[PDB]
Symmetry: D2
Subunit: 295 residues, 4 copies
Amino acid sequence: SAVKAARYGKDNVRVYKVHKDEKTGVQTVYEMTVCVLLEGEIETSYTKADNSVIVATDSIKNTIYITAKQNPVTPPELFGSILGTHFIEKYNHIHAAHVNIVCHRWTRMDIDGKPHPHSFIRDSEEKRNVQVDVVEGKGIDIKSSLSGLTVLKSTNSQFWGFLRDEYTTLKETWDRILSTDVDATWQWKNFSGLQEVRSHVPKFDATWATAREVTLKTFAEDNSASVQATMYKMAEQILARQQLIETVEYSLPNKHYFEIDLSWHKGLQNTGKNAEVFAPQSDPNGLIKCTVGRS
Amino acid sequence: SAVKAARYGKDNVRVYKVHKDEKTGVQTVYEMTVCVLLEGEIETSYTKADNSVIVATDSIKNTIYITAKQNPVTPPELFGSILGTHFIEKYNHIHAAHVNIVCHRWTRMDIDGKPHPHSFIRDSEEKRNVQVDVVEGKGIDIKSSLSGLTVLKSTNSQFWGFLRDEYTTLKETWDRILSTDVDATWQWKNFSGLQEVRSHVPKFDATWATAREVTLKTFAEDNSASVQATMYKMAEQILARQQLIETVEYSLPNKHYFEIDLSWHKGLQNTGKNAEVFAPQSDPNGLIKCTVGRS
Amino acid sequence: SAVKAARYGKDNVRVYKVHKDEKTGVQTVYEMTVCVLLEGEIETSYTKADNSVIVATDSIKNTIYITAKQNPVTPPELFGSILGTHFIEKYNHIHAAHVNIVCHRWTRMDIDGKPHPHSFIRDSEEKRNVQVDVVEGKGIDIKSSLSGLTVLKSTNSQFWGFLRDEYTTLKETWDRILSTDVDATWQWKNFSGLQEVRSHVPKFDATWATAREVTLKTFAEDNSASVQATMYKMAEQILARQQLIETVEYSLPNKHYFEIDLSWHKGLQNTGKNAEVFAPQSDPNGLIKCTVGRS
Amino acid sequence: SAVKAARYGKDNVRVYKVHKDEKTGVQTVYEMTVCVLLEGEIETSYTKADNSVIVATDSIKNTIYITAKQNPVTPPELFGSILGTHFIEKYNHIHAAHVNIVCHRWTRMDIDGKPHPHSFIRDSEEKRNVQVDVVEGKGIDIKSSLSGLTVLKSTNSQFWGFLRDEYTTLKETWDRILSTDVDATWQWKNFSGLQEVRSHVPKFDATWATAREVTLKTFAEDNSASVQATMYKMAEQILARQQLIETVEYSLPNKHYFEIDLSWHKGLQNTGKNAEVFAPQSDPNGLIKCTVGRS
Ligand SMILES: O=c1[nH]c(=O)c2nn[nH]c2[nH]1
Ligand SMILES: O=c1[nH]c(=O)c2nn[nH]c2[nH]1
Ligand SMILES: O=c1[nH]c(=O)c2nn[nH]c2[nH]1
Ligand SMILES: O=c1[nH]c(=O)c2nn[nH]c2[nH]1
Ligand code: NA
Ligand code: NA
Ligand code: NA
Ligand code: NA
C-alpha cells in the first residue's frame, strides 16, 4: 500500500479580534472560525510513525492566534493568504496550506438613530466565507462565498413547460412561492503570491457587496421561469462586474410551500387564486446548481 | 395507579399565510410553527383504550390550518387565543388548550432604497413567541417572548467584588467582553376571554417592540456591574411602560471570551490593556435568570 | 419592582472521569454534562449591584471538577445529591441548588468476543439524566430519566374509534407503523438528606434498568390501541416494581410514516395490505404525555 | 458567459421499506435518505428558460419511490446503481446521475433473549452511506462509507517526537486519551454497468462489515503513536482483504480531552499519573486525513 494523498491540521478554531480607535473611541469586532490543513512531505508520519515531520495541530492553532495578533484579519481573503503563506515559507517540507475561514456577523447597533461605539448584534446567520489554497510554486487560489442567505418571494415565480411522462404528477403553474437558501461562490484568477493579493485588497469587500446586491435584486425583480433561469441571470451579472473572477457557482435549494386543499371543510376555498394558507415542507427539497464561466 | 395529569396534541405544525392588498399590490407574509396540546376528560383513552374521547391529533392539525384561513394570524397573542378558545368551546369534554407559537422573521426587502411589494429576507433567527393557556372557567393566560437575540459589547462591562474562597480562581476585572443570547418573557394579566383579548390587540405589537428596544438600549448603554444588575434594569423599565404586564423574566447565558496569553512567543503582549485577540468559548457558559414583578 | 425569583449558575460543564483498577488493569470511563443553578439571598446582586453575595459561576465550575475528583460520579443520583448538598452547606446565604446531569454512553467494546480493558464506543445518543433539587430544610428531590431512545414497530399498532366531526379527515386503521422517541421520567419520594440517598444507592441503577426494560418490552409486545394506552401500561408496571417512586411521566412524539399511493403509475399497488414503501414525515408530529401516580 | 457545469435534482428524500416474510411472520425494515442529481444536455434551461429539457425534481422524487417499490433496497450499492442507471437509460439527454444514499440503523430488538419479529431500535447515529456516479459510456463508480462511529480509548495512545519550534507549546506525552468520530470511505474499481454490479452483490455487505471490524479492532489494539499511524494501519488491512477496492480514505477528528490542574486547591493532584478528571473540549479539534491506494 501507498499514501496517495494526505492532509492534516486544526479545524473549528474560533477567533475574535477587536480594533480600538484611540481618537474616536469607536471599537470594531471581527469573529471567525478557521480551519488550516497542511500537505507536504509527511507520508512517514503515517507509514513509519515518524512524528518529526509533524507540525503539531496545537502549534497550528497557536499560529492562527499569533497571525491574527500581528496582521489585519479583514478582508478574510487577505488574512487567509497571509496565514497560508506562513506555513509554506516557514516549513521546508510543507508544500501546500488550505485555509477555510467563516466570518460571523457582528453588526454595529443603532441606538436612537446613531451608531453605537462598542455594541453589536448578530443580524442573521448569513456567513461570508473564503477558501484559500496556497501551493508552493503555483501561487494562491482563492474562492470567496456567501452562504446562509434565506429569501422568499410570494409571487412572480412560475414553473411550466417541463418534461411530462409516466413519472410526472407535478402540475404546471404560473404563480408560486419561491424560497431558497443562497450559497454563491466566486473564484478569483490565480494570484502569484502575497504581493499580488495585497495589490487587489480593495476589490474583495467590493465584490462581496456586489455579489450580495446582484443576488438580492435579481431574485426580487426576475419574473422567474425556474430556479435555473434566475440563478443564471445572477451569475452572468457578477461576471460582468468583476473581471478578476473566473467562475461563479450557485447552489440553491428549492424549499417547497404546498397548497392546502380545505374544500372538504364547508367548501372552503384555499387553492389556486384563493390560496392563502400554505404548508412549508421541511423535506424533500429541490437542489439546483450551476457553474458559469467566461465564453 | 391513576392518571395524575395528561395532555396530548400536535407539535411542529408549520404554517405560512399570505395577505394580498388588491389595491396597492403589496403582499405580506407570516410564517409560524404551532403546537396545540389539549387537556380534559380523556383519562379513559389511557386506562381503558377508549378512543372515543380523543380528538385526533391529525384533526388538531386540520383545525390549525382552517383557523388560520378564517382569522388574522397577527398579533400571535390574538391568534393563539382564538385557536385555544375554539377547542374548549367546540368539545364539551376538553377543558384546557395550550397553544405555543413561534413566529419566524420574513422582513420585506429594500431594493434600491424602496420596499419591495413581494420579496422577503430572513434577517436573523430571532423569534417572537407566545404561550397561550385557555382554561375553561379561568380565562386566558398569555406569556409573550422574544428569543434568539444575540448581542455583544466589547467594553463597558465589569465584574469585581464577588465572593472569594478556596474554590475561586477567577480574577476581578474592570473591562471585559459581554455577550449573550437574550430570552425575555412578559406575562400578561389574566384575560377573562376572547372579547377582552380583542380589546387589547394594539398593545401586543407595541409591547413586543418596547421590550426589544429596552433590551437593546439598556445593554448598549449600561456600564454593567454584572449580568444580574443589567438584566434587572431591563425588566424594571418594561414593567414601568406597560401596566398590563404582571411579571418579566429574563434568562441570559454569559458566553465567555477568554484572553489568550501570547507572551511565551517573543514576549507578545495580548492581555489586559493589550488584549486584542480572544478565544470565544463554546462551553461552559454562565446562565443567569431573574423574574421581576410589581412591589 | 421586586425580584420574585432568581437563580444563576453554570451550564454545559462537560466532565469526564476515568477509574483504573490497578489489579485487573480494567479502566471504566464516565462522561457527563452538568448544570448547577443556585438560589438564596442574592437579590441585592440584581437590585444594588452588590456582587458580595455572588459565588462566581466560574467557582461553581471549579467545584464541579473538585467534587468529581473526590467522590464517585455514579450513580448520577448520588453525585448530583453530593454536589447540591455542598452548595447549601458551604454557603450560608445559598438555600437551594438545582443540579441537572446528562450521562453520555461510553460502552465497553467487545473485540473478538471479549470485553476490552480500555476502549469504548458511543452506542446511540440515548441519555440517562437526573434532576436533583436540594432545598435547605426540605431535603432532596430527585427526578431520574431516560431520553433519546428511538424505536419503531412495523405492525401491531392500531388507531380506530376516535371522535369524528367536520374537522376529521384521518382514516381509521387496524395496522400501522408506530415510531417514537421515548422520554420517561420517574420521581423519587423526597429524601431527608444525603444519608438517606446513600442508603438507597443500589436502587438507582436497578430502577433505570427496569424502566428501560419495561419500556422496550411493552412497546414490542403490546398490540397497541393508541400511544396513550401503550404508555399507560408502561408507567403502571414501573410503579409496581419500585415502591420508592411516586410518579412516572412519559412524553412521546408520534413520528408519522405515511402510505404512498402509486396507483397513478401503471396501477402500482402500495396502500393498505399492499403497502411496502412509506414516506417518513419529519413534521408535524403527535405529542402525547401522561403522568401516572399511585391511587 | 457560458455554463461550465450544471446538475440538479432532489435532496433529502426519506424512504422507508418493509419486507414481510409470509412464512415466518418476520418483518425487516430499511430506512434511507436519498439524493439524486442529474447532468446532461440541460444548459438551455439555465440560458434560454427552456424547461422542456427538465425532468422535474418532483418526478425524480416519484421515481425514487417507484424504484424502491419494484427493486430490493439492499445492499445500498445495488439500489443506487439501479436508480442511477434508470435515469441515463430513460432520458436520452441525461448523461450522468449522481446518487447519494444514507442508511439509518433500525436494529431488531431482543426481548427476553429472542429476536423480535417486528420491533426495532435505533442503536446509534452511525450511518452506512454510498455515493454512486453512473456516467453514460463510462460505467458506474461506487464509493461506500461508514460515518458517525464515535470511539474513545482511555490509555495506549502516545504523541511525542513532533517538530518543536517557537510556535510550539504542546508537551510530549506517553499516555493520553484518544477519541474520534470515524469517517471511512472505500472506493470500488469502476464497474462496466449494472450486470457487473449485480455479479458482486455479496461483496458489498461483507466489505462494509470488514471495514467496520478492522476499524474497531485496530483502534482498540494499536499502541498508537499518532492518529496518522493508527489510521494508516486500518486502511492497509482493508485493502489487503478486498481486492476490488482501489483506495481507502479516512477522515478523523482528534477530539481533545484536557487535564485539569487542581493543585491550586489544597494541593489536589490531578495531572500526569494522577489524572482522573478531564475536561472534554468541544472545539477546536485536530482533523487528520489520508487516502491509501495500491503500490
Ligand atoms: O495524533 C496526533 N496527531 C497530530 O498531528 C497532532 N498534533 N497535535 N496533537 C496531535 N496528535
Ligand atoms: O396513537 C395515537 N394517538 C392519538 O391521539 C392520535 N391522533 N391521531 N393519530 C393518533 N394516534
Ligand atoms: O456577570 C457575571 N455574573 C456572574 O454571576 C458571574 N460569575 N462569573 N462571572 C460572572 N459574570
Ligand atoms: O424551478 C424549478 N426547477 C426545477 O427543476 C423543478 N423541478 N420541480 N419543480 C421545479 N422548480
Ligand atoms: Na515549504
Ligand atoms: Na369544553
Ligand atoms: Na445554606
Ligand atoms: Na441518457
